[PDB]
Amino acid sequence: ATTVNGGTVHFKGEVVNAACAVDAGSVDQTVQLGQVRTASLAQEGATSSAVGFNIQLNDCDTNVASKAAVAFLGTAIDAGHTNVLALQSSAAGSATNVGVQILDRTGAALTLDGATFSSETTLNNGTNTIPFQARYFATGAATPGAANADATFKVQY
Amino acid sequence: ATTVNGGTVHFKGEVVNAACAVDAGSVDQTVQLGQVRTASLAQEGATSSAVGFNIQLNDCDTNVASKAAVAFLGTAIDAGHTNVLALQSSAAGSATNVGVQILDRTGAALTLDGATFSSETTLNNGTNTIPFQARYFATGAATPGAANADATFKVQYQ
Amino acid sequence: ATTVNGGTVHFKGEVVNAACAVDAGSVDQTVQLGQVRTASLAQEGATSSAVGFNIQLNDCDTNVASKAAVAFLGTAIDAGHTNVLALQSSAAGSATNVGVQILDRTGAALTLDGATFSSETTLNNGTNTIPFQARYFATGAATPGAANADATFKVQYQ
Amino acid sequence: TVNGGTVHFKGEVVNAACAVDAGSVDQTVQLGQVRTASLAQEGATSSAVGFNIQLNDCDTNVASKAAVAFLGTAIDAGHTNVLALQSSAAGSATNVGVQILDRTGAALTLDGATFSSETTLNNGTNTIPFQARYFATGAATPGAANADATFKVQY
Amino acid sequence: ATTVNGGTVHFKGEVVNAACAVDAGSVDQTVQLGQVRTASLAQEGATSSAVGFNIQLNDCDTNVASKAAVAFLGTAIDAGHTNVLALQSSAAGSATNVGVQILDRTGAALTLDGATFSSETTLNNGTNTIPFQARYFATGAATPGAANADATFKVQYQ
Amino acid sequence: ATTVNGGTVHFKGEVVNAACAVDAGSVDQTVQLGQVRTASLAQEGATSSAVGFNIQLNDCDTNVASKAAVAFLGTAIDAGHTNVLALQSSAAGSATNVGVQILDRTGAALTLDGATFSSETTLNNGTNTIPFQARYFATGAATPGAANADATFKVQYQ
Amino acid sequence: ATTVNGGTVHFKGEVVNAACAVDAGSVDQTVQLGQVRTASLAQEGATSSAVGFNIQLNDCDTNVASKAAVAFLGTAIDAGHTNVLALQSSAAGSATNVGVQILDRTGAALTLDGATFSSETTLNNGTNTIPFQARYFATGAATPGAANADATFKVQYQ
Amino acid sequence: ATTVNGGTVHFKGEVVNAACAVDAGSVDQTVQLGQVRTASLAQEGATSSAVGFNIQLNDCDTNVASKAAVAFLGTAIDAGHTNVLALQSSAAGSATNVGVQILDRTGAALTLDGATFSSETTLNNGTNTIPFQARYFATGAATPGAANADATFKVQY
Amino acid sequence: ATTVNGGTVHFKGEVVNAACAVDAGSVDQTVQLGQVRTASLAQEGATSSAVGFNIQLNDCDTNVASKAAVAFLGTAIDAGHTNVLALQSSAAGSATNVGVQILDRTGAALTLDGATFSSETTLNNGTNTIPFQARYFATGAATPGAANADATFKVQYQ
Amino acid sequence: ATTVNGGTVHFKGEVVNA
């Protein structure tokens, strides 16, 4: 009997012609690095512990393509330290001289130019997972404050 | 002492005379479906898998309303297929011959006109989670691109 | 001395006027079904083994009620099969013609309508546990892929 | 080479110990929906929803206690603690308003002279919580309800 | 050689000059309190059973600080009872006169103003765990409905 | 009688067109290694004792495939030391200069390339067990801290 | 002196107002039924060997309770065979058409609804032990596979 | 021939710089205390049956540490009962005025503050075992319900 | 009356399409080797005292199969010593450079590969017992500490 | 002939340097 206006719902997605499709929980995600003490990141080039995330693939036809690579794109911190994500947050109250570093499964940072892909990983006829790591890289003295970073990823087959 | 002007806050809500109120996180949600391979939607009629989304009702009183139904309003791709939802991502770059469906409880396509209501669901004296599915529909050859859609929903109580 | 903002915490609960309050572990749970062979799920009517899961009720009262029943509100995969859930994991990657059936303690399928309750279970003072099962069901020829399903359940106290 | 677009920048360079985070300058609070049955009685109040105001780069050396006052449009002289609805569309809900609660669950006077209860500041990022709820001053009527309120911060 | 955009990733952290750092999974945790009966919460001041959570501190350095204490900050229900958090859910559907309150390791309510700290815990040279309890406190006659509470904690090393 | 909203249940599984399926208790399991002494892990290239965990295969058909193998995928700690798991714990308070090694039933480290499968194992009609080991390997001077590694296993049937 | 984090420990238990205390070794005891051949399980009514497992009760007094009975609650495999427990193992690789049947001291089966109770046993001041049996009862042609059957049990005193 | 994604496997452990290492079988465990009677736990200060358990320490060397002890940390009932671990099961259906408490080999209740340590025990050149008991202490008229508790123990050498 | 929740129980078993069924006590057996002296295992090849266990087969049918063979699958310590079980006690404080050997009826060490069966044993109608012996085996020099292993066995009937 | 799986075997013991 009684009817009222409920609301609005938006749906998002992408239709791709690649060999594999990215999962809904992997297209857009957020991860927690956690608090990191400044004492560990005292001098330049220091490194803290690494937290782990992953990107999920689905319906990977090995006949079309057998290997998958991922390359990141973001904002570098300085000319020398190209492989560090700068802290993209509010203008006020943001930590400086320290960034987020992305580690490929081989334990080395990936270039942020957008053309350096990860090591080739083989796929299977079904769901697939490619692992990555996120840690803190100190380019100098670490200052207290928040640290939020955003970076996109591109897949090559 | 050192008083500083800040910013502004906008409260948005709706007063209704019905038997239930839609949840605050439910009135406006962004359901993300991830990516779709073109091989899944290569031919017309092929349907990809679905992602479930649910609408939450609060303070439902069964003494005045026994069941509830939800109708969806949106822009169909064409009169030939009135049970899909055309893409509304941007002016350029959108995919072609693809659209999203809003399946009801019985796993069937809903009519996107605001008139055809879904299968009635009985309520209880409390939270009622009404579920739905969203899946991509192929009207031909699925070209690469994006796929975003918007659909309003109206809640009936009988 | 040193003071640092740590973060925030959230608590989720439900105050109900029923006879038994659902346990925290049973409020939100993730049943693991492992993997099932496409050879074992070949044609319509096929059924693999069932994984058991139970719902726990705490602080039951015998004076106010004596029996308990549950009802699941899920998404029927087909109009001809209203007792089978439909997989909803992502737009691509889920299995086709395969669903998950929820069996009550009487070894019978439950139709997902929100009104057809399960078999009654006698209650006792204190803690009470109600068992169930979940299994895979085949509506045709299976297709390799993932299978994630969600369903809310409604509990009555006669 | 083709033309792109236009990008605007907004913000304030304030001389304070704490600066408001970019996510709190202009934010939207989805109250949800409220049934008229729970608001039919005059003076009845519905349940609240929570929104937070975030302060960044706080210096505990010069500032210790912080508070927030709200400026808005009240419904009536008698009910000065309620905020009237400023919805652009006509046919909005009648005899209803929104109240911004305090840290101690008390209605805030919307005149700009009454501030929130003092909250101790912490080095780095300090968050102060608040709630928004529906206040019915009479017979509620179905319709939309959009309201706006500015906040001024005192240290 | 198909190269396609996959998506985006966000990272959240807080670099601080503190004796110990909070775990990534402990900076923002959700606690499922299950359900509680209106019969149990009927009487004024009735306190239900408490569910336990924990804050995990890592990389502790006993040289710079040996005792750690935290204080919680939230929205109190009323000035009479300042040690009870207020429910923060949609504008309609939440319970009344019932709120989540926090207990330290000494079984006492924590005043929610950001200035009253819990009992100080001695830190080791490694991982430490600070336990806490959350329980439902009734300021009067309870009402059936959901209860979603949020709170913020403030770490202090002394 | 009185009815209330009980809760939500999720079901997770995967259908595979293979010779053998993986047990529900084996698709996602947690292995405890316990504390290890930095005195024993001080020297570079040291090795501690192993903890036994096994992968269960069910409903194997010998006709489809007579031999089975499993390979591991994870983040190598260093390029030169490719056969060692890295640390996947929080970003603070985690032991460095150490990692986790996976040992095949032949007592050899398994390369984490994702294409280096372990030694083949015979299959029999019914439930099968594939054992493995996990141990600590030091790439230098051991440091105090926690350790939480993770590895994705892919099974081959032939 | 070199103090480090050790770990955690969990305590589980229940408090009842009855005249007996159920022992921890019987609250969550596990029984092994061994293996059986499909030759002995070919038609309706075919049985196997029955192993012996006991339920222990201590701290009992004869002043309040003199008789004790045990009622098993579990998932019946079929409506007709209400006294046969099903196979709640992993979703694949389990047996088909074979169930677990719980016996009594007299020799009759026990219904798994929970309302019916077994034969009453006399108690004594101190420690009491109630024996039971478990066997295999095939409802038809037997199939190879695992079988992990779970069932709760309640104790009566009158 | 056929490749199929199986799943994920986690690992958990610690690398501590100490004389002895807590065994993986004792880092975390669940010990059932059975059921108890309100008649037994009727009055304040009552005591139910004690269930025994042990903590195992592997790789113990005596040239760096001779005596070892453990300390427990948990939530007490009140200010007047600081050696009784409280109950943490859910928001309903739990017992009242009764809590789990821990006893060392001597038979004394360990304070749950985390500072007081157990009786010092000598270390042997090999696997060592420290026994403990858990029991129910009633601070009043006990009530029917469940009782779950968690405690955190730390080792001093 | 005064029914209370006693607890829950589990039953583990397996139905096999074979000529023999293993004993319930035999399927899960824990053999203990006792404390040994390092001087007895100081040099490579030295073995400690050998203890004896057995596997019991019930309901053996001579017509279906008149022979019985067993193969043991486990983790080998080294590629050169593939007949020695690796130790799976823990990740620290486990005796190093030693393993356990399972001698068959004739005394020959059994390879851990799944294709290496023991000597064929004549089958008698009804219950049979097949004996095996467990002993230590030290390579190089033995070291103090615990040494525990694990291995599953496949029974072949011919 | 037919090959089927058996149970699990666990070994326990300790080595002492006395």
Numbering used by the authors:
A (entry chain I), H (entry chain E): 2 to 158
B (entry chain J), C (entry chain G), E (entry chain H), F (entry chain F), G (entry chain D), I (entry chain C): 2 to 159
D (entry chain K): 4 to 158
J (entry chain B): 2 to 19
From the paper:
Uropathogenic Escherichia coli strains use filamentous type 1 pili to adhere to and invade uroepithelial cells. The pilus rod is a helical assembly of up to 3000 copies of the main subunit FimA, terminated by a single copy of the subunit FimI that anchors the rod to the assembly platform FimD in the outer membrane. The assembly platform FimD in the outer membrane of uropathogenic E. coli is the catalyst of type 1 pilus assembly.
A 3D reconstruction of the FimDHGFAnICHis complex at 6.4 Å resolution was generated (Map XIV). However, multi-body refinement with blush regularization in RELION-5.033,34 improved the resolution to 4.0 Å for the pilus rod (map XV) and 4.3 Å for the FimI-bound assembly platform (map XVI). This refinement also enabled analysis of rod flexibility relative to the FimI-terminated assembly platform. Despite a greater degree of motion in the FimI-bound state, the observed modes of pilus rod motion and its conformation remained highly similar to those in the complex with a terminal FimA subunit.
